[PDB]
Symmetry: C2
Subunit: 305 residues, 2 copies
């Protein structure tokens, strides 16, 4: 057994492996999430987390050899994990373990935000900021699966092209800029001045204010961790890791989304286990689209082993 | 036809009576209530431009609430976007309710705003469920009282803050179901609520002591504001009834139906009223502005027949 640790407080360059009804699983792939970077740099305190707390997401095999993926409150960046079966899903036959490790966090977050909290209804109109981000992509897949009208902001033309390739249902009018507030005029015009029913937000300061102005009356503002009253707006603070009966709803939504073809893996950037430091450094640069994953163990050709 | 207008914005001494939807109904106003917005307008603290009913009236925006008779002579009560402080009103029937035979018109004028607001806030927005726990700030205020009635009708556990011992006694008389542990101070309520919920907090807060109130929320709690957040997965609802008044909608009729059912089921009870005759409308505004009452300030435009 080994786990990943920051040997020097706050220094990403010091990231190293250290040898040292619950289900015991062998980890094949462990993904990096934003929280991991915040923990490693000391920007987030371990006390804020509900030895090393790195890693909340993995794919691998259970003791029967079955391919699984899951969420853990901590210690996912390790060679094995022990977790509640309430936080495990079967990996579909059409997925690699590599890509299965990109799924649990972003789709659990997106289903919780859109369905459980936002109560999105078929045909409603959404603004999903930073659509090429992990949670944004998952939210777009879900919204489209419900026949919603989707608007999304992207940080570059390349990110737009990426979303166009991933989601053929998106047309040119689906896209606006995440790097300014021009998405406001865009969304107002294409909704006839009515605005959107839901905003999924990760932006700041002036872009946040512009997002509030984008809401229709009774609009819901989903934040992933005068007008407000005139428009009877609702604001949701959303933090997935707090879950570590509502959760079982999220689990069921993810599972159904997997079976129904809604849940699709992200594109991954893969690092061998010995390059875990590089993986963290890379993740922190934020120049990729999709998931950064660490290959702890290579997947075998066998389906069950 | 006459209506109340402040001839000079911000000067209550300038308050005077001034003589003057295709399926809209004309109603004779017998009683017109005063609401917070009226006082803010009359004292000049609120601009008419902030009011959506500014497009509904061409002169006075005073008065959103009345009881009286429709054209058939039936006793009705209702909401208007503006110009409720008048001898007659023209409004959509979607904003009228029949007055129950056991109510006076006088007290019927105290019902539409506070119960529409509380049903919209607790049920439509807050989605309150039977047995949930609420903290209702300023329970003797109009909306606070209505919210307490609704919560108790659903078998909810109620905590409320009050401004004085007299206001506590008032709530005790009105709501026999409230016990001693229901009350804390609006002027320490955090410690009270935490102790009596075993540190769990409340499911809903109806609400400037926000930091203390937010900390009162159970994880996944809802904060209802009449016009840690992440750790607790909190929801904040901005609530303004007045947005609905300009024209009916399917959204409005849901609230209308809740009030109607609440009336029929004995949940909706008139408030206690302080009545001013029409000729004393200035006194009514001045009184209202001091806020030394419990219940409703109501202007008698016309006495109900004996
Ligand atoms: Cl009070
Ligand atoms: Mg792929
Ligand atoms: Mg009475
Ligand atoms: Na992770």
């Amino acid at each position: 057994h080994a786990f990943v640790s920051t040997l020097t407080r706050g220094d990403l360059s010091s990231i190293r492996w250290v040898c040292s009804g619950a289900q015991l699983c062998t980890v094949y792939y462990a993904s990096l999430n934003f929280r991991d970077i915040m923990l490693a740099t000391g920007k987030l305190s371990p006390d804020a987390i509900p030895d090393s707390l790195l890693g909340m997401e993995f794919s691998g095999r259970d003791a029967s050899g079955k391919r699984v993926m899951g969420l853990v409150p901590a210690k996912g960046l390790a060679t094995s994990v022990l977790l509640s079966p309430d936080f495990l899903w079967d990996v579909p036959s059409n997925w690699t373990l590599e890509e299965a490790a990109s799924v649990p966090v972003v789709y659990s977050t997106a289903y919780y935000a859109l369905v459980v909290r936002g109560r999105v209804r078929p045909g409603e109109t959404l603004l999903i900021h930073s659509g090429s981000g992990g949670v944004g992509q998952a939210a777009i897949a879900i919204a489209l699966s419900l026949g919603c009208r989707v608007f999304t902001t992207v940080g570059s033309a390349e990110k737009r092209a990426y979303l166009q390739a991933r989601f053929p249902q998106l047309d040119s009018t689906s896209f606006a800029n995440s790097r300014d507030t021009s998405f406001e005029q865009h969304v107002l015009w294409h909704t006839g001045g009515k605005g959107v029913d839901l905003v999924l937000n990760s932006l700041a300061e002036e872009k946040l204010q512009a997002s509030v102005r984008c809401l229709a009356t009774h609009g819901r503002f989903l934040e992933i961790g005068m007008a407000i009253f005139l428009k009877n707006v609702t604001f949701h603070g959303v933090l997935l890791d707090a879950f570590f009966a509502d959760w079982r709803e999220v689990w069921a939504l993810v599972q159904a989304g997997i079976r129904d073809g809604v849940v699709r893996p992200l594109k991954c950037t893969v690092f061998h286990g010995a390059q875990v430091e590089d993986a963290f450094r890379y993740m922190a640069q934020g120049k990729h689209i999709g998931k950064v994953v660490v290959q702890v163990l290579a997947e075998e050709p066998e389906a069950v082993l």
